[PDB]
Amino acid sequence: MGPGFDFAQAIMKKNTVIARTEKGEFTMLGVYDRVAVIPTHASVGEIIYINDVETRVLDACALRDLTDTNLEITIVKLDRNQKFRDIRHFLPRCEDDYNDAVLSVHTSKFPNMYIPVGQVTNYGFLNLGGTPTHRILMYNFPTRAGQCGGVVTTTGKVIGIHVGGNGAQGFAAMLLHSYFTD
Ligand SMILES: COC(=O)CNC(=O)c1cc(C)on1
Ligand SMILES: COC(=O)CNC(=O)c1cc(C)on1
Question: Which is the catalytic residue, given 25, 106, 148, 162?
Fold first, then answer.
């Protein structure tokens, strides 16, 4: 409807795939080459389905900060025959707050879904499903089962992936440029 949704759509149409693990179907953001991200609770294994194609996982790493605290981001390298458009220049360098964010989801259950979530708070520490987690972003939307791995954008920036909610607020893990230096 407006430039927030325009940026979000441009990211979904070229930089997302549907990832299936034993723990369900997730929106998965492709970042550069064959490298993508998914929430660590997806429990990526040796094989994953990508748009319903059996795909070998070449490498997967559950990120933690230098306090050895969960970040809830897994970086996956896929044995795929095609590279993602490089979107690393849209990743923030620092932890920050944001206005006017969009959460975008693409699965069999929720195709072409875009949610204007509004203001995003650098919340930081949260107990997420019993797991102490850092760098959590918070927004006041009653997000639901099926939105995990959804992409959080502003106009011009890709700032996080949706990892949970409590029924009133939703929670995302930050994406930082430093995660994807090669
Ligand atoms: C909204 O209430 C909160 O708990 C937010 N916490 C902070 O202020 C905070 C945490 C980190 C890291 O940087 N600022
Ligand atoms: C503050 O309330 C919560 O932490 C709600 N829990 C989740 O969002 C959650 C995510 C996963 C996986 O398992 N539980």
Answer: 148
Contact 106, 117 (CB under 8 A): no
CA distance 57 to 77: 6
Q: Is 148 a catalytic residue?
A: yes
> Contact at 8 Å (CB) between 57 and 42?
no
Q: Whose CA is nearest to atom 1 of ligand 2?
A: 166
Q: Give the Cα separation of 134 and 160 in Å (integer).
A: 13
Domain residue ranges in the chain: 1-15+85-182, 16-84
Tokens 């204007």 belong to residue: 116
Q: How far is CA 104 from CA 12, 27, 108, 109, 173, in A?
A: 7, 9, 14, 13, 14
Extract the runs of DSSP E, i.e. beta strands, from 65-112: 70-78, 98-105
How far is the C-alpha of 151 from the C-alpha of 29, rounded, in Å?
Answer: 7
Entry resolution in angstroms? 1.6
